[PDB]
């Protein structure tokens, strides 16, 4: 599958401007300067960059390069546990599969970041893992230009809970969870509206949908994942903060890394939202939505 080479390819635009050219053999002054410039130019942001230079300078008395990688990877792991295991030497070839904490995943994000396409790729990912998957077409206030989630469901043989344009999205989500439960489904992906400037406040609508999910199943949704487009950069972060404050994210999916030189944005994303990156979109293929691996990510940022 060339998992690792696919990621390197997806991060090529980001890496080939400055990162891979850093003169790791010169005197400190030069190499530190080039490193800071490369990090800033990749959208790592000043805060995170300044911290790296501090962690690698005074501290980090192993190989400079090795130090850098270690700090970048550390910034990308919100979970202390997995970070500990990593330090203990835990480094499997294939990144362990992402397992949703519960049966329902509420998918959120602004209109156009790729929520529909992402859910389709997730449906495939989880079907291949043997899960029985269901979709709920929550964005019922629009005819999502292009391929509707309903059409993707037919292509993948995944049932799609849906209603006429304008249907109460909370009521739809409740029906989907009941159907998921009644029909013995392992996972339900609830798509949601993404337009921030309509007659219906978006955050209020999402909170209503989440409430409805919980009403049908008191423990759900155990995952709330925000989809963010890498191309957008640090812009999709202020908004991300609002989604987090309204519905409580448990994870982030970053798409279209291959279309920007700003792939370092995943660092500020994790430091700001303090939730894990679940998958990364490295291309537009069905298997181009890869489960995130901090170590592999950082290696691809700086190598090849």
Residue numbers in the entry: 1 to 304
Sentences from the paper on this structure:
Finally, in the ground state apo FtsY, the position of the guanine specifying Asp258 is further extended than in F1 or F2. Interestingly, the interaction distance between Lys256 and Asp229 is maintained but the interaction with the the P-loop is decreased by more than 1 Å. In apo FtsY, the IBD has re-structured and as a consequence Arg142 and Gln148 have returned to the active site although their positions differ from the active form. By superimposing bound nucleotide from the active form, F1 and F2, a clash in the van der Waals spacing between the apo position of this motif II arginine sidechain and the γ phosphate position of bound nucleotide is observed (not shown). In apo FtsY Arg195 is positioned away from the phosphate-binding cavity.
The functional core proteins of the signal recognition particle (SRP) and the SRP receptor (SR) (called Ffh and FtsY in bacteria) contain GTPase domains and form a distinct subfamily of GTPases. SRP GTPases are unique in that activation of GTP-hydrolysis occurs upon formation of a complex of two GTPases. Here we report the structures of two conformations of FtsY in complex with the substrate analogue GMPPNP.
